[PDB]
Amino acid sequence: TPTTFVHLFEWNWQDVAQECEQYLGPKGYAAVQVSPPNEHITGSQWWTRYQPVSYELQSRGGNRAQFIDMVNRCSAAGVDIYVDTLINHMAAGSGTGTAGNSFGNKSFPIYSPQDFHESCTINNSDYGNDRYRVQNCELVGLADLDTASNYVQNTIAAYINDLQAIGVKGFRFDASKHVAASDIQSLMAKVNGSPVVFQEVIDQGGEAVGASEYLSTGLVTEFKYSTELGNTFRNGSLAWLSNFGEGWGFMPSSSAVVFVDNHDNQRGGGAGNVITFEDGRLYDLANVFMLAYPYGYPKVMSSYDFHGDTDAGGPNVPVHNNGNLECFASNWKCEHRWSYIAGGVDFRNNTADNWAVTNWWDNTNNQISFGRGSSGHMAINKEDSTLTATVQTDMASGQYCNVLKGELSADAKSCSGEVITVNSDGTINLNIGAWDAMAIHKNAKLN
Template sequence: SHVMATPSSTSTFVHLFEWSWADIANECEAFLGPQGFKAVQISPPNEHIAGEQWWTRYQPVSYELTSRGGNRAQFIDMIKRCKAQGIDIYVDAVINHMAHGNGISIAGKTYGNKQYPIYEPKDFHKPCAIKSEDYVNDAWRVQNCELVGLHDLDTDSPRVQTTIAGYLNELVKLGVAGFRLDASKHMPAKDIAAILKQLQHSPLIFQEVIDQGGEAITADTYLNNGMVTEFKYSVKLSHVFKKGRLASLKGFEKDWDLMPSDKAIVFTDNHDNQRGHGGAGDIVTFQDGKLYELANVFMLTYPYGYPKVMSSYNFNGDTDAGGPTEQVHQSDKLNCNDQLWQCEHRKPYITGAMRFRAQTGKSQSIQHWWDNDKNQIAFSRGDLGFVAINRGSQVMNVTLQTGLPAGVYCDELSRTSANDCSGKTVSIARDGKANIALKPMDALAIHRFAQVN
């Protein structure tokens, strides 16, 4: 039977959106492994429609491993090289539907009239279009009609279930450690359960269910199958950082009506809502600069959910634009810059907050919460770590109880590597108190395993 593997609360993964398999393999070796990330979510690896837009990846033509990311050999090489660095690969599995209409695939195959290499017309639901009001009052249509014209697989049929399970089992055999199940809200939870029952191992499962409240289908229906994306977190965290008061984050888990921490995949933004797709609101993204880094610092240092860091590219306001044609890792240079790949996961404060999470995960309790009722906050992770964030426009300068033993601590966010003390330091007195000084739009995170001797 299917037993869910739970990631430890010490872990962080990153979505390398539209990165090629060769780039991901290089990034595992150059950065993700040495820094201590847990896993990478990759773009869909299966055969998809031809075209330049990023979303061609969400129109499957077959489950053959030929995609813009690379071919099967490159896919296998990526898994091996990442695994050697301790990095898992999570595949974005597009299983609710197949490509719209007629056309040609990236591998040069033709499809049309619901005829694909692995499916035929009888494998699909009778066509009807999902209308916006269906989300509010017609669960059946959301799951049985077509999402933006994509031919909807009859996921209730044993033949379809076996075909999908065959695809997932093949990936697990190649070393894939987890799956994002795309468009899960558009599949009945029992159909997903029937597919998962046929898996030969227990990969990490997270279902993409967009539930911001007020819809006919709710995220909790899917919790028995595994983890679920917590969109309320993305929307509410974004709102607090953009327009609200950080002080209101005190005890947010109780106020925001969220799913249990060990079921929740949390993120600041994702590949859809950062560009206004997938019913987005006003979300924090790389375009918010320092504000975005602070939102990620909060997500990564606070013990709620399994956090996913978004890694994006500059799309110049064109919400359909595919990624840069330049690879990230070119022979002699790294194309992480404002114009091309954003590489948010390499921003020192974001990487540093990820390392802080890895070091403090054993203490899930929040203590010594402090705020100034506005945009300055601080809290400890039991007696293992302490965090302060100043999102205000005034200097923060206050003496606070840290809950940590006396000593001089290195700030994990501002040091340049995990082995030096090149950034800020904090001196904690014998009573556990310390002077915490932060410029506007700055943060610090100290923990027991980074002290000056």
């Protein structure tokens, strides 16, 4: 059962298309969140995708024909496409867009000055006390659309609807906190059917606009998950996570989109708790916890090495560079392909018939282990000494592949990596080295 999606950050359409066929599909990833496909300002920086010029499908990722080719190929492979949608604003200043269109002083090919809120700057103190300014003023000089306008709503709804006709199945509503939920509610009335919709609301608490306001219009991103997972793996105790979710003050599980990191917070760096690809084995573990724990709708992040430059765009070379995969090195990192992360995804897919956390065990510090009923069990050792405890599981006796390190063979007599034994009483005598882990499930059992 598909349970996890991935953000192929700055991946062009031909690369996403190929990735769907030879990797995402076969592996069971449910969907791919793509970078904004609409016309945007020119420049090589990543953030240019967040400054729209028009709704024409001509971007850094490719043109309309290439976008449609990608949605056709991914769908045939069983993978949905979620489009990153800009509902709050258009580009700042004046310039040229990727399709040739010029704009300037709140004048675009599809909007005129009257379609925007009157200019004002959002200052850092407004987030805390002034909701009106967080929603009606300009986020870093970006022309704030008058999202209450029937015309603005029909123009955005028409873009969303053209995309669904092409075959797109979900949408990420960028910067939702800056759009009144009532406006998002009218817009949704104009959207045909019921596509997956997740809204980006950054709410760490004490904000004048809360994420709970967006629960009725779709899924919401729970940034507290990302923020708290990092503080816990970096400075806290994993034992604390026994009841991660609602008890930590997070929104309902069925309404949340969770991640260890996203394209924005992985850039900030230095003092900040977020765990990213730069943390190596720490990143594996955080991901294994996320993918094993039954909370939220998780998205795996796929980044590129930005080399300290937080404005830089992606590598010059494509991912699939003529039968030569450009992953894991100094260009694309390809985390969705990392042994522990992919294995975590395989775990989540095979334990979807039991969303409970059973037989939770910890050492009060950084060694944990828990099960998903009789569907699977896992353990993490984030300490410098071998984990040898005996834990209780609800699993059938026999030998299983630790899916974080290998898989079951065609004949089903062996695994390509470490094997874990479940005793007749249902226990496991753990033998997990320092900073390592295991995950086993019912469909990766020997002979």
